[PDB]
């Protein structure tokens, strides 16, 4: 799918930031193993040419530029144009892809160009040259740097930073007075920002930086406005925070890439997360096969509740049934948490009387991805695991029959699963005692009998209100009565709290101002919501020392990394919708 690009521009309101304030790029970026990992992500990342789409987006934003003193847009259409190092490529395009649509007027938001200047050895249309050294060229109002970049070394990157200073000087000489130019920040260095600050901040009236990110890297794009026009342009606190955000995000993406499996490698089963499939031929289930039973039990232990597809095909004179699934690290944790090796009943298998054709293995089971509801459940699960801590008794509200949280929870600390609907899992194999209560998740009086250390109410609070037909405030008061039964020092409850002003997301959920509730058409359900102030006051009354913290799921892709651990592709729009719902449905940490 599409990549995420981060664009920032000079803001006078923003407090000025110093070159010193900006963080240095990590040395690991030039590590060879790190480069191989980034290459692996590039292989695992499926998208259209990053460069062409990036040029179109940057051009549209450039066309959005307005000069404030003028009261008119900074960009004037048909101004002299410069494209640095246009590249034909070995592809045989013969020019930058972005250029063709712009020439054909196929790019929305692009005013017709009076002229287009082409440069670059690879591009046949562009002047065939290398921008490594100074050369004679025309003066153009607009400059776009697309030159292929070759650097002697990362240590030479300091020399490379000086060459980039030379590149900027060349851009200035090429540009007309009052002109503008664009240079991609292929390498970001603190010295580089310092140099631009020392000699170039005055030269250009305005500036903007956009990082189009399709894959994890620190490359940036620098935009220069009012070139040849004196300016006081300087770094700003907001811009610096954006840079810090970029570095943190890159670090997280790199760490995920470091855990990435080999692309289309031969699977020997070594991977903790890897396909699990075995073939059974002419199996006899009339009595206890045992050997077949043992193999099935082992496969189940490997799957750890993973979905497994079975095909029975006849070859070499005999029908053969193959079960196919994928092992996982979390499933492996569940397997390690089994105290003993369990056995299974094959009556359903004996019941099976059908033939399935053979299939060829592929690492990815399917390309569907995760539903926004599924994604939010993952965000909540990741948050709970982060909330998982040493030596803690646990209580879970609205627990499902699957109870995946138990697999997530380490064996040493005890946990409690509670819901109206009975669970479907078996607890005999667990290495440590696990507690599941067959009582309504909203049922009462069991708490008075139960001793309390820590309690969780995830993805069940709205359902509880719907079941008891209570208002969110009323449900919360009944919950406070349960809390009176409850003794947990630390309590987290998923809550429908509209911390943000109510805003509906089209296609997913409908929120009612008249009745404080969230109705989700995507899941086709309606659950009420309540005012935060009243709940906070009630909580302080319940415990004078009680401290409740709003939980920030957003700003973190680690729950998305958990999906990657599940080999699940992630989509930004659904994640954003889930984040908006979380702003109106935060988890209360108390």
């Amino acid at each position: 799918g599409d990549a995420l690009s981060y664009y920032v521009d000079y803001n006078r309101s923003h407090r000025v930031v110093l070159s010193s304030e900006l963080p240095q790029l990590p040395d690991t970026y030039f590590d060879g193993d790190e480069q191989y990992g980034r290459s692996l992500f590039s292989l695992a990342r499926k998208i259209g040419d990053r460069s062409l789409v990036k040029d179109t987006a940057v051009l549209k934003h450039a066309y959005q530029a307005i000069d404030p003193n003028t009261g008119k847009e900074y960009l004037r259409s048909r101004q002299s144009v410069a494209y640095f190092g246009a590249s034909a490529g070995h592809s045989g395009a013969d020019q930058p892809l972005v250029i063709e649509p712009w020439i054909q007027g196929k790019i929305s938001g692009v005013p017709p160009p009076s002229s287009v200047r082409q440069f670059g050895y690879d591009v046949a249309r562009g002047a065939i040259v290398d921008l490594a050294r100074p050369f004679p060229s025309g003066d153009y109002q607009f400059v776009y740097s697309d030159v292929d970049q070759v650097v002697d070394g990362h240590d030479d990157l300091s020399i490379s930073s000086g060459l980039v200073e030379s590149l900027l000087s060349s851009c200035m000489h090429a540009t007309a007075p009052g002109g503008s130019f664009v240079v991609k920040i292929n390498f970001p260095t603190r010295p580089v920002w310092h140099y631009i600050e020392q000699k170039i901040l005055p030269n250009i009236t305005s500036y903007m930086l956009i990082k189009p990110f399709v894959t994890n890297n620190v490359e940036l794009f620098f935009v220069a406005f009012g070139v040849h026009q004196h300016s006081s342009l300087t770094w700003t606190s907001g811009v610096y925070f954006f840079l810090v955000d970029h570095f943190y995000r890159y670090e997280t993406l790199s760490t995920i890439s470091r855990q990435l499996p080999s692309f289309g490698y031969v699977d020997d089963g070594s991977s903790v997360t890897g396909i699990e499939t075995i073939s059974i031929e002419n199996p006899g289930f009339s009595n206890m096969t045992q050997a077949a039973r043992i193999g099935i039990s082992g496969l189940c232990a490997n799957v750890g509740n993973a979905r497994k597809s079975i095909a029975i095909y006849e070859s070499h004179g005999a029908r053969v049934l193959t079960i196919t699934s994928r092992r996982s690290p979390a499933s492996a944790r569940r397997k390690s948490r089994l105290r003993y090796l369990p056995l299974i009943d094959p009556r359903s298998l004996e019941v099976q009387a059908r033939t399935i054709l053979p299939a060829d293995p592929v690492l990815f089971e399917n390309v569907s991805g995760a539903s926004p509801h599924v994604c939010l459940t993952m965000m909540y699960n990741f948050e709970v695991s982060s909330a998982v801590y040493d030596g803690d008794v646990v209580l879970d509200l609205g627990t499902g029959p699957e109870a995946k949280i138990l697999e997530l929870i380490p064996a040493t600390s005890p946990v409690t699963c509670v819901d109206i609907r009975p669970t479907a899992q078996p607890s005999g194999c667990w290495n440590v005692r696990t507690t599941f209560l067959e009582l309504d998740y909203l049922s009462d009086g069991w708490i008075t009998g139960v001793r309390g250390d820590i309690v969780t109410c995830m993805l069940s609070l709205g359902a509880a209100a719907a079941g008891k037909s209570m208002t969110f405030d009323a449900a919360f008061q009944q919950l406070i009565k349960v809390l009176s039964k409850s003794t947990a020092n630390v309590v987290l409850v998923q809550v429908n709290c509209p911390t943000d002003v109510v805003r509906s997301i089209k296609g997913y959920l409908e929120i009612d101002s008249t009745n404080k509730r969230y109705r989700f058409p995507k899941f086709g359900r309606d659950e009420p919501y309540s005012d935060m102030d009243a709940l906070e006051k009630i909580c302080r009354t319940a415990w004078p020392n009680c401290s409740i913290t709003w939980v920030p799921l957003s700003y973190d892709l680690r729950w998305t990394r958990l999906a990657l651990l599940e080999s699940t592709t992630l989509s930004s729009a659904s994640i954003r919708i889930a984040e908006l719902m979380y702003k109106y449905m935060p988890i209360m940490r108390i």
Binding site: N282, G284, S286, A353
Partner: protein
């Protein structure tokens, strides 16, 4: 379920209904000799994958055919085989009508064994005019056959009621058959000669006949 290398379902279907037996009549003989185009008995058999006829499905009669197929010399073309067979049937039909007037016995009983042997003779173009009186079933096909002593021992041999020979082929292999996996197996039904078995009226007397008979 599994016995030996074979696994079978414990649930089974056992039917309680069987079709009632029907006796053969002279009109039935005439209709079969007529071999109506609307329901010609012969059925072409096609290799399943090809769907191309490689064999012939065989019904009743022609169950008296035991000679080498090389002697028979069947036409390769299925349609040509049908045309030649139809001409032979028409001529044989005039001959049968001449031998016995239809008015005298429209549905009279005839010896099925005799009918099959006559089919074999006509196919090998041998004279069954001598056996034509024998063709009509008088009372017992077994009794009538026990009375008859004419013809070669090879053409047909009955020790009293007991008679051991091969019945007509269930399937006829055609020229196209290649013994392909897609080709259906005829289980030796196509074989002109597969085995000789002794037919007799009573099992106990048959066993007494077989007291020292090779087993």
């Amino acid at each position: 379920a599994n016995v030996w290398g074979v696994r079978l379902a414990d649930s089974l279907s056992s039917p309680t209904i069987e079709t009632r037996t029907r006796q053969y009549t002279l009109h039935d003989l005439c209709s079969d000799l007529d071999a109506n185009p609307g329901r010609e008995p012969w059925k072409p058999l096609r290799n399943q994958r090809t769907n191309n006829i490689v064999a012939v499905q065989l019904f009743r009669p022609l169950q008296g055919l035991v000679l080498d197929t090389q002697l028979y010399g069947f036409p390769g073309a299925f349609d040509d085989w049908e045309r030649f067979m139809r001409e032979k049937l028409r001529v044989l039909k005039y001959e049968v009508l001449r031998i016995y007037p239809i008015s005298n016995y429209s549905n009279e009983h005839v010896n099925v064994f005799v009918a099959n042997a006559l089919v074999g003779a006509f196919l090998s173009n041998q004279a069954f005019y001598d056996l034509l009186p024998l063709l009509i079933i008088n009372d017992t096909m077994i009794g009538d056959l026990l009375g008859t002593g004419a013809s070669l021992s090879q053409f047909f041999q009955s020790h009293g009621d007991v008679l051991e020979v091969a019945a007509g082929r269930k399937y006829l292999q055609m020229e196209n058959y290649s013994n392909d996996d897609d080709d259906p197996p005829l289980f030796a039904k196509d074989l002109s000669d597969y085995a000789k078995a002794f037919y007799s009226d009573t099992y106990e007397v048959l066993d007494r006949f077989f007291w020292t008979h090779d087993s």
